[PDB]
Amino acid sequence: MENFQKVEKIGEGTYGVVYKARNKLTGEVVALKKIRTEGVPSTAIREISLLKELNHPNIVKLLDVIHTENKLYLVFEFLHQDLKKFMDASALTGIPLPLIKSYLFQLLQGLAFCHSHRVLHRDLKPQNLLINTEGAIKLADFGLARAFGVPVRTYTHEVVTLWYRAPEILLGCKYYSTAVDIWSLGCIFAEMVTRRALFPGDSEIDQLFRIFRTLGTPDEVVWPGVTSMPDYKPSFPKWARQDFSKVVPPLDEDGRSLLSQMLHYDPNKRISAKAALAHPFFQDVTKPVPHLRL
Numbered sequence: 001m002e003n004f005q006k007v008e009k010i011g012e013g014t015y016g017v018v019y020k021a022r023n024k025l026t027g028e029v030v031a032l033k034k035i036r037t038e039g040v041p042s043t044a045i046r047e048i049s050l051l052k053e054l055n056h057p058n059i060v061k062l063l064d065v066i067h068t069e070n071k072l073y074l075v076f077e078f079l080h081q082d083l084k085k086f087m088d089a090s091a092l093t094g095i096p097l098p099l100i101k102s103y104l105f106q107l108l109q110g111l112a113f114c115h116s117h118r119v120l121h122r123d124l125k126p127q128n129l130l131i132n133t134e135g136a137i138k139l140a141d142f143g144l145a146r147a148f149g150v151p152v153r154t155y156t157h158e159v160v161t162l163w164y165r166a167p168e169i170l171l172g173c174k175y176y177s178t179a180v181d182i183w184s185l186g187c188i189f190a191e192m193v194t195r196r197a198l199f200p201g202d203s204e205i206d207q208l209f210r211i212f213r214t215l216g217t218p219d220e221v222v223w224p225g226v227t228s229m230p231d232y233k234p235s236f237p238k239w240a241r242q243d244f245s246k247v248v249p250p251l252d253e254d255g256r257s258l259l260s261q262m263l264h265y266d267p268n269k270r271i272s273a274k275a276a277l278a279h280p281f282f283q284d285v286t287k288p289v290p291h292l293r294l
């Protein structure tokens, strides 16, 4: 607002416009998000305010929540680049495996923390993962979807991606669990490895069928209860599961094994962030410094 001098528009998120701004008094540089209408659910403000206590090194810190004139501003710690941008910039040679592994490991520590505190992200995607020059990666917008809701776009005609959405969400399950975040992270993990989105659906049904075409159409054997879900249709085509080795080549067996557990259809069989941290894939994990051009 007036306490903050806008440095520039960082973009227009799935909620509202985001600016890079400097606190005229503290000199701190932050990310200011103008939340989209006419009242601001008091329930929403309490939820959001709880998130200010959710502090972890791999979680973008929510510094302040400012409610004024039906407008809600969220002040976040600022990071210079997101993983989507970094992946595009690394498309020619790919992100080195030690760095992919470091990033996956840090993201899982972040999820483990939020999940132990009963906070869900629900909308993880590369653009929501921020990185810095120190080799750190952080989860942005944790808990906002719950304090608010699931968008059809953003706030003003903007196609929200479904590429990282768990199948239980696509099948209409009303109660999501921490498992939805593990699914999204597995999709991101695969994308870092192959340099191409795993399931780039362009509609809810195309998203679902792209998943089915790769992991096989789910049935009662692999996913007890699936045929009774809200949007499940007996008319869904029946595709056979594809060999995992064809999915994320040339990822090694440790990596393929972890990814397979992160992409289990049954949310109850899907690996937790905590258990994933103990997976043999992280046996030689390290913290490399990325080459970022800011």
Ligand SMILES: NC(=O)c1cc([N+](=O)[O-])ccc1NCc1cnccn1
Pocket: 010, 011, 012, 013, 018, 020, 031, 033, 060, 076, 077, 078, 079, 080, 081, 082, 130, 140
């Ligand atoms: N907290 C942030 O720093 C940040 C916030 C949003 N957002 O709320 O939509 C988007 C990108 C961000 N950083 C990455 C970034 C910042 N400036 C230029 C390029 N990338």
